[PDB]
Amino acid sequence: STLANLTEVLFRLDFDPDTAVYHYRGQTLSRLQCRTYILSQASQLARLLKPGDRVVLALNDSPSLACLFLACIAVGAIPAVINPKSREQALADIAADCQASLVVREADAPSLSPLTLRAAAGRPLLDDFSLDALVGPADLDWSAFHRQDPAAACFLQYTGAPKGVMHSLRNTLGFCRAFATELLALQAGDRLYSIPKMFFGYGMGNSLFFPWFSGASALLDDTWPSPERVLENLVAFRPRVLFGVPAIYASLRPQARELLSSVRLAFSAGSPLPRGEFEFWAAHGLEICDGIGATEVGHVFLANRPGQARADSTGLPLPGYECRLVDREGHTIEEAGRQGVLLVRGPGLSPGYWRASEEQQARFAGGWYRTGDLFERDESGAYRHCGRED
Template sequence: MRIEEREAMPIEDWLAALPKVYNIADRLLANSQLLPATKRAVIDADGSYSYLEVQDLVLRAATALRELGLEPEDRLLLIIGDTILFPTLFLGAIRAGIVPIPLNPLLSEEDFRYIIEDSRVKAIIAASHDTDKINHAASTAARIKWIEYDNGLNGPGIGARILAASPYQLPVATVADEIAFWLYSSGSTGRPKGVRHLHRNVAVTIECFAERVLGLRSTDAVFSAAKLFFAYGLGNGLTFPFGVGASAIYLNERPTPDSVIDLMETTHPTVFCGVPTLFASLLASPRAAELADLGLRICTSAGEALPPEIGRRFEDLTGAPIIDGLGSTEMLHIFLANRPGQIRYGSSGVPVPGYEAQLLDENGSVVTLPDTIGELVVRGYSAADGYWNQRDKSLATFRGHWTHTGDKYLRDDDGFYYYAGRSDDMMKVSGNWVSPFEVESALIAHPKVLEAAVVPWKDTDTLIKPKAYVVLQPKVVATTELTVELQAFVKEQVSPWKYPRWIEFVEELPKTATGKIQRFKLRES
């Protein structure tokens, strides 16, 4: 069925057409039979791999994992970087009915120990430079059958096992509503939670966002600076390109302006997926002018709300619009988004096809008035099955068909949603709600400011007022005069009573591995 025909089909009808026996790995490998034999699926630091080559590796990985003693429904931790081995092992596990759980390789030993115990995994595959940390973290886990290390596809360890295995011909007969994989939430305000996703959830995000919003096609090459171990990067860098037959470009190292620009100049992506802090850093880089000649078609941003000034400046420079949107680990990918040709920088856009959104007031009633702040709840078919071993939190988040995001938003007359802040970041000043994002956006619009975070702070009378933590552009010196200048600038951009009463200049802001600012750490400082 052509994409034009599918776009006219209600998502419920499309979903009903999915077969009951359904393995998402098989769906993502289907393009290996439809595309030219030389069509590149993955480009990483060691080379490029066609769809046929990736299919062969995935089938061999499925065999290798079964030969190592893993059975369907066993859980496997993947603590590896963005290389060809990630899709090989992730899809190989799913095809064999094994449940992969990708994790950030930079987590602490304590976090690894907690997740190993919490998830009850049977096996671990980890980056070779983390041997001591992983061995120590797993030392008390009685369920662990084995630990293998990633020394590259052609090195000793799991790569050698994969290449020595024979292709596993038939996928395990999983069903669309069966658990395919877990993702651990970023844990920005506490212990990470195991989020369980179904096979069908991946298909929904490909259909609803990748195809119906971004218009991804097989001629695209997608580079996601956001890493594969979390939801946004997993869609951008694996399920979306594989779902449409595009090429995925991987950067295994930390995405700095230099490393990102270098990779784009050699691989020529048409689609770039980043986070707001990276877009800001790219614009502040001495090499920013090089971005204009990269030939980007479109970009995406998520993780944090994109300041409008950053979005406009990046599009003016590159000619590529940034499709800013809101997603979550619980919903697997983006469910609110701007659209090509219908972008309002500063907003998170409108509901993605197949999703519904509402705002609730403090009493749980639906907010009907425009420009009124409420808690955002969303309904869609990619919602997770729940949190592992966290019944109360599952009940608080997944309420019937609606998922409670914990984000505060307002909606304008045209139906565009505007981020106000996390529920626990909002503050009342002089009896009125203040959105930290609104104040942060005003600060970032100043040419001397690179990043900003705003949190509630008590004055000498214990009254709540905004406090700003500011990262300045390179070579800008922090002075008392600059503080006064920034405060006056904010008063001109927003209601005067919203300006930050205190401004603290810092070298960097605390962030999660996914690029979200950890405002709770600033509140506690």
């Protein structure tokens, strides 16, 4: 194929560079402001990292995290975003698993025993992460994108021993198109608010990629989402699309009036949406679309479609995806009402784990991802979660 760079591709999308992309602490950054900052930061990272070097970002959601992530990709580095409050041994184990060359952490955090840089105290709108003092200020017109095969590993997503899922340019644009375009039909200018953070694959797509992919903007909050905080954000930001999980919508019941004010598309992932929650908000005039995603598949690959959602259901495979149920002998289940393990194949499929044993990599056997989830399929074709396999 043609060598390409995921960041460069996103920067090339023909969206108004003067429109917002990220929101943070009441402020706003446009596509142009972030593009310029990313290129500048890339000139600094290229002095520190070579193509292929791994980077672990133990940071909460912020524009500097999204920009640093994309700056790593710009130079050919392979970044991963993990829980900033990860325990020392957990962060060390992840950095060891991907043999990271660089770890970026919050302020005052201890050192790992790879190179450790810390973010600045005060939560600035754009942080240099001490790169100015380390490698000097940035170059003014940087554009030395490292272009590689679209199927090559571009970044990692970590989910017992941690497993790092490889994601490439191809299957990244794949799961963005399938979900952000074909399922949600996100429009330029849409205000997005994802409560799950960017160290969760769910949140990375919601907050990091979709604003660039679809021309929308996302609210980034580096504090933990207490229902009180979630409320302040809703009131101040008034998002049109809300990415939550079942428990989040349960916690939002007493604030239904405030949520209905702006939210028009409410999505739920992570675990099955109970009928009670779907029906509580349906009577308030809000449809919650339940969809399943998996780190190994990029994002949601099977979901209820807006305007056609049903209670106690995960919907249908997204366009381009194929879903199959297998019995205890690995044989395809052709019938309805028979629960089996769900296999999935499609645009978002990851090319595999970064480091793993043959038994772990076997989850990708045959060109499918074995979710380990028990699913059944009714006559209409809709899937319903039934639990996990033993």
